[PDB]
Structures are given as C-alpha cells and as structure tokens.
Symmetry: C3
Subunit: 423 residues, 3 copies
Amino acid sequence: YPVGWFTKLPTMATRVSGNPAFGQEFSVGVPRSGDYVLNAWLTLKTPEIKLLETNRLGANGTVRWTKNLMHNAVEHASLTFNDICAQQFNTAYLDAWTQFNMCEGKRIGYDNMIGNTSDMTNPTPAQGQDGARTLPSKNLVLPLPFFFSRDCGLALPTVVLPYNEIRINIKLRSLQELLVFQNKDTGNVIPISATDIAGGLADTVEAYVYMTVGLVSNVERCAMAGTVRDMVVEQMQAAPTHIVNPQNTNNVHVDMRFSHAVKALFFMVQNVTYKSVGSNYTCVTPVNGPGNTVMEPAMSVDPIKSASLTYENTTRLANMGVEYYSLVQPWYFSASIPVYTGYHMYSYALNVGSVHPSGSTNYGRLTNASITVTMSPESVVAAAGGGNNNSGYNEPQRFALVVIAVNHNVIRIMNGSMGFPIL
Amino acid sequence: YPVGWFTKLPTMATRVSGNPAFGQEFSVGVPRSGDYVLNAWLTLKTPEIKLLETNRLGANGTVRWTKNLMHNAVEHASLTFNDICAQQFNTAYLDAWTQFNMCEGKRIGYDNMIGNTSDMTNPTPAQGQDGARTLPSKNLVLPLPFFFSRDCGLALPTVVLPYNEIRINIKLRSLQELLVFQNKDTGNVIPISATDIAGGLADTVEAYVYMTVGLVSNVERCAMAGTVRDMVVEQMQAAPTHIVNPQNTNNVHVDMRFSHAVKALFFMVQNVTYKSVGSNYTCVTPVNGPGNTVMEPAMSVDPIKSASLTYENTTRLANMGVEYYSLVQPWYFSASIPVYTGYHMYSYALNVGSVHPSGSTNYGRLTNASITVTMSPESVVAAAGGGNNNSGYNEPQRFALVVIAVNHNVIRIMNGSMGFPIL
Amino acid sequence: YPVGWFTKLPTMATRVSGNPAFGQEFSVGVPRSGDYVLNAWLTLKTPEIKLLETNRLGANGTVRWTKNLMHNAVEHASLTFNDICAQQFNTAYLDAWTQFNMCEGKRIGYDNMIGNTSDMTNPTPAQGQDGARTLPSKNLVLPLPFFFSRDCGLALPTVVLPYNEIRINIKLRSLQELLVFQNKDTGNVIPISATDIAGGLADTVEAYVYMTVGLVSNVERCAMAGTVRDMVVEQMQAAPTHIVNPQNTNNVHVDMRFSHAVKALFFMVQNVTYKSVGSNYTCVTPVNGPGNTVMEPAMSVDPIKSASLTYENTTRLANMGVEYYSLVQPWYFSASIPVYTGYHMYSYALNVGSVHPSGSTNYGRLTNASITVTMSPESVVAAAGGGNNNSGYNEPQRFALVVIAVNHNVIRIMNGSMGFPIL
C-alpha cells in the first residue's frame, strides 16, 4: 500500500541581472524559497549575417569558416555556495563532459542544440558546422550539469537551509564566429564593416535563464528541514596553466596540485578563436576557400605527439600515442566517444558517487604530481597540411593548458553548525 | 549458496481469430494456463508491386512516395483485463514511445524493422523510405510495449488468477501506401487498376502472432498462487480530439481531462494518408516527381508555430518554439532523438515505476487543464514550399489531435476480492 | 560519516613470453601478488604496405580488399584458473559480444579501434574497411572481456588465494589481410613477392600486454584474505562443429551439448580468409575491382535461409527468416545493433549475473538439443551476385560452425578446500 499525495513541479523563470551583450559578466540569481532545485538551462540566440553558401568569392568571407557560438560564449561558470567557490566550469569542461557522461542519446542531440548546422548539416561537435543563409531565426540551448541534477534522491534541498546565498556567474565572450572573424588570425580587419555583407548588421545576444522549483508535500517538508542529512557531492576543480610555444623542441613539466581525492584527470589544448579545430589548416580545396570541411580527422594528424602522467615520482602508464589516451581511455569507463580535436583523459575509478571511495587518487598525502605534453615541430608552411611531425602556422594559436579535475566532497548540513568533514 | 532448479521459457505460437486483410478487426487470444507472460511480437508482410526506381515517368507512380506500412496499419491496440479497458494504444503512441524510452540502440534497429528501406536506404523513421523493386520478399516485426515486458521482477503472473479473460485487439488499416495511393489526395483514382504496373497484383497481409509462456519451478509456483502481491503498473490513456481547420487564424483551446496522476503529456499531429510527413510538399525536384526525399528537415519549416500547456489556470512554461518542445524536452529525461514531423512533449517526472510518486501531475484534485496549438496560415501555393508562416495544400490534410498520456495504477491481487486502491 | 583512506590503482606492464610473430602461440603471465585484477588490454600494430588508392590497376592489388587485422589475428583466448579451463574465447565470440553487451557508446568506438579505416572511413565493423596509403603509423587496441571486468564489487580478488596459477593464452594468425591476400582464394600466389609494391616489405607484429593491479587499504585487506566469499561468475563455453558443403541441398542436424544452465545460444558462420563478408562477391563495379564497397547489405542477400532451435525434442520458435533471428532477437534484451554477415542469436533470460536464475536453459536434465542451418543452392556464377536462392563461389569458403554459449558457475573460495557447488 503506497502513500501518494498531491505533488507539483513548476518551472518558473528566474530573475536576471545585467544586460546580456558581447564580453560582459552576467549574474543569475536562482530562487531559494522552494524545497529543492534541479537542473538549469541557458538560452542564447546567435544569428548569422551571411548571404552566399560555401562558394568561393576570393577574399570575401561566406559560410565555410563557422563554429559553435554558444559553446564558445561561455568561459567560466562558478557555482558559489555560502560565499564559497564550491566548483567552477570552463570552456574545456563543457566539451569534456559530453565525451564522458553523455554516451546514450545525449551526445547525438547535443550536436544539434549547440552547433549551428543547417546547410550541409552534420551531427558532430566539429568538422563541418556551416550555418544557414541570411538571418537564421533559431534558438540554442545549453544546460549546466551539476552534482544534484542527475537523480531525485541526490538533489540538494533548499528548504533545510534558506540562509545560504547561492548564485551562479556566466561570463560571456565578445569574440563571435562568423561575425568579426573569418580566418585564423585577422581577416582584413573587419570590426563592424560590411564587406559585401559579411560582417554587418551585427546584433546582440539575449539570455533567457530559468530554474525549476521543487514542490514537496507538507508531510515530508517538516521532517526534511530539521533532520541532519549527510549528502555526497561531486565538485569540480580547474587550474589554468601555460604550455611552451611551438618551436624546435616542445616539452613541458608543470606540476599539478589540488585538494582531496580526485577521480580522474582530463584536459584539452584549445585555440584562442577556432578552439574546436584539431588538425592544421591547409590552403588546398576543399579545406580553406572553399571550406566544405573544417579539418581532417585521424588523431595522428594532430600536432600533439604523446603524454605521460606522473604519480608519486614513478611511472603510471606506458608511453602510448594520442590514439590511446584520447580514444581508448574514454571508451573503457562509461563507454563514450570523443572528437578529433585534442582531448586527453585517463580511466581510473569505476564508481562515481558512492559512500566509499573504491580507488581514488587521494592527493591529501601526495606531494609530487606533474604532466607533460609533447608536440610536433614546425619547419613547414601552412599550405601543405599538418601531422605528427610537421605543423603550419595553426600551432602557436593554441597556448592555453587548462586542466579540469573532479573531486569528492561531503557537505555537512546542521542547523547552527557549519564544518568540513572528511573527503 | 544460491538456489537453482530446472527452469524453462518456451515461445509457443498463440491462437488467432479472424482472417487478416485490409481494414478489419483482428482479435488475439493470448494463453492463460502458464505462470506469467512477457512481450508479444507481431508479424505483418506488406510487399510492394512497383517496377522502376526513383526515375520520373510523368504521371505514373514509382518508388518515390513510399511510407512505412506496418506502422500505419496499427490503429488501436487496447489491452483488456478482466473485461476492463486498462490501457489503449493508437498510431501516435507507437511513434511517441520510440522517441522516449528507446534511448540506446533500440531506435536505430527500429527504423530497419518498420520502414521498408531497400533502394537508397536510410536508418530513419521518415525522410527517405523507398522500397525495393518488384515483389520484395521480406517480413516486418512490430512488438507491443506493455507495463510488464521490461523486467522479470515486474512481470504480471497468470497462474495466481487464471479466471481473468485477457485479450488484445489489433485494428488493421485498409489504406496502404504504394498500392492505392501515390499523391497527397487521390492519384488519378486507382482502386485496383494497374496503370503501367503501379497498383495491380495487390495481395493481402498475413498476421503471425506468438506469445511466450512463463514456466516457474514447483517450489515457487505454490507460493506465488496464494500470497497477496501488491504490484505497480504504468497504464496508458488516450483522448482523440479535433483541431481547427488551417485558414487565416489557427488557435484552439480544447480541455484535457484524465483520471489519476499523469507522468507527462505528449501528442502528435498526423495526416490521414501520409501521416509521417512534417514539412509541406513542393513541386520542385527532387521533392515530388522525382521524389528522392520525402520532405526537408528543420523544425522551423513545420506549420506548427508554438504551444502552451495549461495547469491550474496558471502559466506552466514560457512560450517557446517547436524546436524547444520537441528536441530539448525529450533530451532531458531519457535522452532520445525524435524526428521532423510534429511531436510534442514536456519533461516532468524522473522516476517511472516506483513505490512513491516523486513529482506527478495528480489530476484527482485538478479541474482546469487545456492545451493550445498554433499553426501557420496559407495564402500560398503548394509548389513553393512550407515554413513557419506559409503552408500549401498539405495542411488541411492533418486534422486529428490525439493526445496520449501515461498514468500510474496499482492492481490489487486477492483471491475472492477485486477492489481499486489508491493511485 | 563515510570512511575514506589513501587508495591507489596503478597499471604496471605485465611480463611477456615468446616472440610475437605471424601464427604462433603467445602466453601472457598476469601478476598475482596484488589484491585484485581487473580488465586487460592488448596492443597489436599491423601496418599496411600498399601505395595507390581504390583505383583499378588491372590484376594488381591496391586498397579495395582490406579487412580488420586485430580482429582476425585472435583465434583462441582461454582463461586458465587453477590448471582448469574455466572459459575459452574464439574469433566469433569477439564479434558476438559487440552486438550484445555493447549497446551504448561502446560499439561506436569499437569500430575505430579495430578496423583500419583511413581513406573513405566508415564507423562500421564491415562494409568499407579501406586502409591508408603507404606505411600507416598507428596502433590497434582490443581488450579481453571477462566475468570480473564489469564492476568493482564483482571483481575476482587475488590476495585471498595467491597459490592459483592463472594464465591466458593468445593464439595469433599467420594469414594477414592486405599482405599475402587480395582475392577470395589465391591472388596470383604472392607469398612475399612485391608485385608493383603490393606484398613486399612485410613486417612482424608487436604485442604490448599490460594488466592493472588493484590496491586496497590494510584495514580491509586482512578481512578479505581470511573470510569466506560466495562469488558468482559468468563463464563461456564453445563447441566448434562442421556444416555441410554448399551444394544442391543444405541441411544439418548436429547435436549441441554443454554443462550446466546456459543463458542463450549464439553462433556465426565465418569464412577462412574474409570472415567478415556476408553477401557474395560480384565482378561488377564497384564491388570487386574497383572495390569501393566490400559487400551489399540487406540480410535477404545472405546465403543462409533460416534456422530452428531444438529443445526437449519439441518446437521452440516459428520458422522465421534471417531478418528475425539476427535483428529482432538482439533488439529485445540489450538493444545492440548487429551487422550484415551471418550472426545468429536467440533472446531468453533478462538478468545476467544474479543470485537466482530466473529462467535458464538448465542442461543438467536435458538430453536432446540440436541446431539446423538452411543455406541457398548455387547453380550460378560469382559475377552476378548472391541472394537467398543463388550463391556464387563465395559459399564453399565458409564451412566452420563454431557455437559459443554462456553459462553460470559459482566459484567456492575456501582456505584448504576446493570443491564444486551447484550451478
């Protein structure tokens, strides 16, 4: 004999603060008078202003060098809780979670709700992201994955502690693709000019944020706000570093430090403008003018040679190529597929979210942890292609080595006491 | 030390009643002398009688306007239990369950066992379903999803109550694609005539129904038929309505009423003949003669503008387009990619089949619930295309608004007592 | 208040024995001084030695008849435990597990890490597996699925019994595709000759085996090696037979016997060289010279007509075609799409790995079990194609009927006692 009551679950639009534009700080004030919060969603519309298709028009920019806009607009998304930075997001973490957790039908639908694919569409995160024609009326949706947006039993209640000031920050990007850019560096300097309609009539972006509010019956509402609840969360930790400039020799050895136990380590080398490009550009059709394809696949063409993780000043894995650390590593656990760009990961634990860590890199006693990245030299032009031994001018553009990790924490919920227990 | 015994699980062919033809009532008598029942499969062979490929032959009909046959033959499948209509199916529910529960590799294989794709095949429920050549010898399989065909622990036993008269009904359709139709309305009136071999040599359909029989060892057979078992089921509820005719203005406000708590609401606007067509037809090659592609994708081309669900005479969600209610809504709970036709869905609950409803629309106390559908006006010919603002003559063909919902019920099993508990 | 300790999980490279070459026995000695072992991985590099693309060059062999190398190199992988053959693998089981358990993103990534796909790539196990150009520098990875490589709670501990001698055997194959073969039988007899660079500069294969070692804290290490533990495993059982030669009539009735309860039966008819080819070859472009496509899809073109499983000298399922036993059967339990080659499967149980068999073919009391395979006659040349009624010379090449089954066993762990309990 089950017990059922009149339950509800509305989706009221949360308040916004600040004018959403290009390159500005946008704060979102999620409500706190409800029982428990769930997953959030973001809405950003970025229409193009092109005209012709993928045909070559000399030095004019058409629909051939287009990338995802909403995926590049985000830069940092920190979830502040009780005036304490619990977890923070970046541009590399938004693409790393798709190639790890999203294994079922979530990855297929992610390519259509992020990348503007109309003319010659392709359900892929990269390699062919051409837009529409003139003024495409559409909307883009990008959710924010959290540690309580996966199950109803692991949700964070807001009625038990209505005094905490929670707030998320969304940092937008001023540089937009297919609007003020067309090449790898600068395209004839087009800030707002309309050279044969290819950079004019630029419009701003609109941010429509909404957060659902949980509604529990009054029978279980009094018992929830008064009883001690020991919850388990999975926060994120990032540490942006710097990689050596591509030249004759490429070898780094920057140390990596964190806090408690870390499940796994993952990072991705990205560019400053076309961060979703793996292989080097080529001045041979059809690669760059006309650009029917952004870049060729095959991880062997990527300038990144190999890598090696350091642990306790001892070896951790055999010196394998990029085809094993980027493909086979996410294929073991969770069974997900990546993309030809420059991802790196290492399979470790097999249970994410439990009451006992069964194999986790406890960094509380470790005092030696670094990472190395081997790249390919240049000594070649950017009109012949790339590879594992030669790279054109599309290599010095990427120089940001941001490593994002995931740790496990326990939030102590107590009326009148706020402490930090064990990991 | 586990306990094992000699277990069996055969699949005996059940009996049939009635001659399977075109447009007739076909009853299936599932056995009841066994211990329990699982899933049932249906077999219907619908061979074509065409000759040429997708080449244009003037007014003659070839292989260019073909749709799925077994998916259109099913019209109503009601599962009668104890002379009480527990749940009923329709033509819209067979396509809505594919874009919801089928998230893994179930949707990819569903396109091959339903849609006849031979010449220029495409693993998709629509957009390119061309058949073979002359007399294709093949068979089609379409099972019936029930509330006890998902796990062995939630199966409905038949040995505990061998007095209930269970029977399922299969209503076939007389109108078959690529046999008596070729255009949107009537194609030169071809009832049985063979105009250059394009509608002759029509054959009937054969129905091969078989239901597996559960076999439980005698150690647990006596304890099952005698002990009270409180099982939880997930029935279905449908309510066919009527939408306004496409004209200058398109706005409806038909109320929707049900019974107990409903998990989520979903419906789909379908045509009378080519119900698997979303975008409007165009008289420009290659759309209609020759028809290499049935219709263009992009949800913006669909005549349906937007919708809004009513709850407690208050707003429920922001007025979003069709790209958000058809793509992002099924992307949350159970990420399953849909299709470009005209499906609507709203994410709500996150646990289907539990002992406690954690967020369900309890309709037992609600007295106000409606739905609205906004379409696009005409004022344009059917030879230029469709869109969100103009539609040709392919809009008045669809006028059936059948909404299918899912509710939760508890079947009280008692020897000598048959009552209805709570939801 | 959870309990956490400093845990580790290294991946030390295990020792190797024997020189890895073409057609030799390679033994792998996994360590046993650790706490528990997990999943293992294999590394085999098989570079091609071609030059031109898929262009026709007369009788010369180019890149048009290429198949997977690492999938064909393995032949028998037996996991010996305590000098007892617990389970054994074959070439058919490595492809059957992909079309069964691998339902999510595991099958998509399996096609890229097995089949050499560079020029005109295709994420599919067959139908288009062309290599690169000259000397492709790449590595292939193929793990070994076991009964303890699916979850951390069901892992086999090695610290509780450090006296058992565990060892796995890897039998390599001397016949390699795109090296000493180009046609169906013999291609102008090319053992090592380099006819216009198409079979010269042959290199050996390197085997890099590594097995991770489990590390548990000392608090739970003493309690694990001393207390009894009743674990449940899922072993494999194979039985290679022989099918009748393709002629005027094709009908077999070889009995099948095993041990305890079997979950399900599955087999696949494979060739001796191009075992990943289902449809018959055709001398019409583009099938064989130039070979842009290996074979056409559609299960109706396969020479295998139908089959029927025998159980207790009684019928078990209706005489359905190959489109029902190869597609609809894997579509039910664990929705995994197969491939067009000749795979057979029958859905039975729904729970794999539990404490109570809820429906298993207990062969302990059965004394009658056989299988039949119906094929198509010849009486046609190999230059017109295949089908369900006619087959060319590509039918007598396949004559190995190896049936692989899966059973359930219970390993009794006791210090000083080694017995066999029930199934």
